[PDB]
Amino acid sequence: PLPQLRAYTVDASWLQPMAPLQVADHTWQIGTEDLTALLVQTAEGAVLLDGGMPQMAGHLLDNMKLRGVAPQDLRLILLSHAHADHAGPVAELKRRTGAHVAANAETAVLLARGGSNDLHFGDGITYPPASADRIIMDGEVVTVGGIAFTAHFMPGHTPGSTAWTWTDTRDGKPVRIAYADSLSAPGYQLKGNPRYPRLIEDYKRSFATVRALPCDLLLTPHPGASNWNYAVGSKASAEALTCNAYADAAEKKFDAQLARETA
Amino acid sequence: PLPQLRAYTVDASWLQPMAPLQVADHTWQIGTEDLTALLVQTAEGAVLLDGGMPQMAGHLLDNMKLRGVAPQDLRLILLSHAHADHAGPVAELKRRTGAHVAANAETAVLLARGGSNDLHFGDGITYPPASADRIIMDGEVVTVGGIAFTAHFMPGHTPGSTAWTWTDTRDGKPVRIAYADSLSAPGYQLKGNPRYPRLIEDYKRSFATVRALPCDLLLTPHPGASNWNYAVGSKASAEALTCNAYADAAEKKFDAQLARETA
Amino acid sequence: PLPQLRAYTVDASWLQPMAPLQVADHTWQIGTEDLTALLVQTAEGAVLLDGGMPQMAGHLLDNMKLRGVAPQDLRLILLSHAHADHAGPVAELKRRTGAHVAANAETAVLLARGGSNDLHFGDGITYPPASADRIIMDGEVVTVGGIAFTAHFMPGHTPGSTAWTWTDTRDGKPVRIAYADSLSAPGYQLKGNPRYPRLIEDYKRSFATVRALPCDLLLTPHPGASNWNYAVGSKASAEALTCNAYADAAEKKFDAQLARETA
Amino acid sequence: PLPQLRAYTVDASWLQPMAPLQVADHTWQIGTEDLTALLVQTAEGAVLLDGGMPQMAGHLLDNMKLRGVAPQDLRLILLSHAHADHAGPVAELKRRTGAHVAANAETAVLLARGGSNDLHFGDGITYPPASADRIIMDGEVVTVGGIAFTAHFMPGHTPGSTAWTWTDTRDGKPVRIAYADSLSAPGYQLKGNPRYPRLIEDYKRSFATVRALPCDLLLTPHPGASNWNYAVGSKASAEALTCNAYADAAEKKFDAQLARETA
Asked: Which protein family is named in the record (chains A, B, C, D) (predicted)?
């Protein structure tokens, strides 16, 4: 017979729950040890950046209750990119919290079809669809409870990959936080791709965009990409990379993969 | 860690491809031996009723080419209900054929979210989302190439279950074909369901709707439900049931399941 | 040349703003003197039923601020039907309040295309489109802050017309409020309508549905339909009709219009 | 009372119908004398670029019948930008022809909400919503009947403005046709726009994109923008501009308007 449908299987560390880890005075890591889900607590509600796997919806709500954040207090959901391992529980979180989802046009159309018809993965990695409530332009500022979030487009991993920057505090003194999406091309066809003709040009420009980001502290959807280690608690950001080191190491791998593809 | 995502696993007979089996002068079974996918060839294009599993998209196009039906000749896609085992390849068939999808409001909203947030199954059975192009009302007539299709609402299995009736020919003499959805409640909570408060009333009315259907030849999305056997070719409709026998046997099981639920 | 686009022109009384008029301990009329927009204040947020004309968005927010209801306190928007003169400002209210919209499948698909492609009016009466966040079934209960709202389907005016019932208080003693949609067919083709084949059957059943509604106090999207007069303030409900009188008078006009159509 | 809704009123020349005007061996102007609606007839169907005002749906179908193009022969609809005066009848054309709509993400999200919530015009200019069937990336090639269409992004007038280029013939000898969107900012706030923070950068890059377009014959959604005159028939392209002259004149006006805004 025809082959059975195969689901998205990941490592066991991507689904290992952890307690809320503090990043700044209002920024908390409430995801897992290998998936970043940031919670920003303001005076007029909470903001969530990414969510992880689709089955992490209940775990995210439990950590929000640990921080004193009721479900109806979640006001907005921000996304780096609309893939299943980071925008999975968005649909379920909208129903159980009443929040809104902000994303650009490319992330909105990919989120609306549940990651299906992917430019590189096809229908292999899908998740429940969700609709975006506010369309975001490049450089637009989103304000929730006095905390301003600025969107920075960085197409490559997905056409709608977006980096979010905001200024928090660390016991009074300010700190610039940058949450940038992945800059990798896992198994992508880089040259002459019919679905993404200008893929190389968007990666090169995104490398420069990440370098110029105002950032004192960098975080990525996968903690290992920015040399974070959520398991060691207080010393999690000890070896974290800079925006230059994160972009320089990404461009060196992109050039090597682009060279091997030629051969 | 959290449990891995589990996909929809079915029997091997649901994915066993078969050659186009003739039902009438213009009606053909082009699905598998355990999944019904009807092809109606007209003078101004072709019409497809249901599709089966999501991975059956390539198999459906091959049988259409066997009948001399080009991809651009598929004009319309009709659906009984928007579940994965029967509306799976709808999204892929729209891209590769340029056809339109007609469905009622309940089937359109379930198809738009890929079967997720199901009233009884939740997110356990999902598929790539698709958007309906024409909304159909109860009793509305859809005409393609002189062949009139009449929609008959029969809510129960899904809130938007629809039966389609049309008149074909069998070597000149006419024949009334009825394609009715399933009348079963597999594992449903029948009494006091918060997601479907009037589930019992819709099943009772749907039982009467199927009995009154103008039908000389009955077909169901699952061939065993109407006692069809696609494997024996010409003698496939030898033991096929009537609309009364199909509805009477469905209501007897519904009453028994409703009685066991009380206990 | 071709004719210019003509907009939806209404009477001056439909756009005459008024102060919040109290209906019960938690129910307030915050629309205009000829358009009903109900505000239900609970302990965990506010609920809005209908909105009126699209340009009434600013007026609705001002009356909510008069009641001490911040924009972020609006939690849910309920709709009777998705026409421009009652679901107009829904799209703008979602952006400026962060609320969610609950509606059935028929109201959701009509709201998603902004009232265009109407079964009887075509594209003559349009408004900014909005997407529903929660799909509601017949008889489903929606709870906000301890106040339960029950949806009652009554198709006719639109295929997704819904009546909402809830129990409030009047200085301690309870009162059953029923917000039923219009039961009129203004200029509709009642017999043999291709877009709505079973229009007569849905009107007859909706007449009986309104009679059986649990109701001590009836309100309609147009106040004159239920003999309300918002201009006289405290004596607004003095001449209000019952559910029987409202349905009996509607069925008598429907039979007369159906008889004149035959001629 | 509140102000009445005001519709989109245009000049009488935008609604002045005209007969099919030939541009190349397969390219025809089937719109009006002041609105461009291009019809490309291939061996495997027809392609339509833009449509004009919403009320021009019937006029477009009549000219298609004059060219021997049946409604079911229209295979694809391409859009320059999703404004009412050029994407108006898209929703009605989809229902009456069965065609598909191809657009980028920005044009798809603006077309899905009927031009409402415009970045500069708000809800002042709306039209019936339509859904895109295929999402197009920058530089992607769309092939219909052996004629290849290449999309060139040129954001500015709208965030999803797209220029389409294709090679036709003029009695055997080939000719490169370029259909570029408007490069004007009518009444836009150019500096410090919250809804479009990087508006100036997108206009500057779009000016350079239009200059480098492979083009022997340039056409614009408004004929006067490229110095076309559909009224004089055969001598319509006598004074048509080049891509350089069209972009140079657009950048000179943009710099002047940007200078006056500073004052």
From this structure: Belongs to the metallo-beta-lactamase superfamily. Class-B beta-lactamase family.
Query: A5 and B8 in contact (C-beta within 8 Å)?
Result: yes
Per-domain residue ranges of chain D: 1-263
From the list A75, A95, A131, which residue is nearest C98 (CB)? Answer: A75
**Phi, psi angles (nearest 5°) of residue B257:** -65, -35
Active-site choice (C26, C34, C50, C86): C86
**D189 burial class (0-12, 13-18, 19+ CB within 10 angstroms)?**
middle
Chain D neighbours (≥3 Cβ pairs under 8 A) are A, B, C
H or E element that contains D16: none
Tokens in use for C153?
Answer: 């389907």
- Is A118 annotated in some ligand binding site? no
Residues D36 and D27: their CA atoms lie apart, in Å, by 12
Q: Which residues of B touch C108 (CB under 8 A)?
A: 105, 109
3-state secondary structure of A224: helix
Token pair in block for residue C182: 């219009």
The reply to whether residue B140 touches residue C197, judged by beta carbons under 8 angstroms, is: yes
- Residue C257: other Cβ atoms inside 10 A: 15
Resolution in A: 2.2
Residues in chain A: 263
Helix axes A105-112, D105-112, angle to 10 degrees: 70
From the list B135, B139, B198, the residue facing C197 with the nearest CB is B139
**CA–CA separation, A60 and C241 (whole Å):** 50
Distant-in-sequence, close-in-space partners of C128: CB < 8 Å, separation ≥ 6: C54, C88, C91, C92, C114, D113, D114, D116, D117, D123, D126
Q: What was the elucidation method? A: X-ray
Contact C80, C164 (CB under 8 A): yes
Q: State whether the Cα torsion A21-A26-A30-A31 is positive or negative.
A: negative
Nearest 5 degrees, angle CA A117-CA D104-CA B89?
A: 25
Task: Report the distance separating Cα D180 and Cα D81, nearest Å.
Answer: 10
Contact A103, A82 (CB under 8 A): yes
Question: In angstroms, rounded to a whole number, what is the distance separating the alpha carbons of residues C226 and C180?
Answer: 10
What secondary structure letter does DSSP report for C2? P
Measured between CA atoms, how close is A56 to chain B, in angstroms?
8
The CA-CA-CA angle for residues B15, B17, B19, to 5°, reads 155
Rounded distance between C-alpha atoms, residue C49 and residue C179, angstroms: 9
Please indicate whether, in this complex, the C-beta atoms of D7 and C3 are within 8 angstroms of each other. Answer: no
Q: Write the residue in A44, A98, A131 that is nearest to C131 by C-beta.
A: A131
Q: Which whole-number Å values give the CA distances from D146 to D37, D50, D166, in the listed order?
A: 21, 21, 11
Q: Strands B21-22 and B27-29, how do they pair?
A: antiparallel
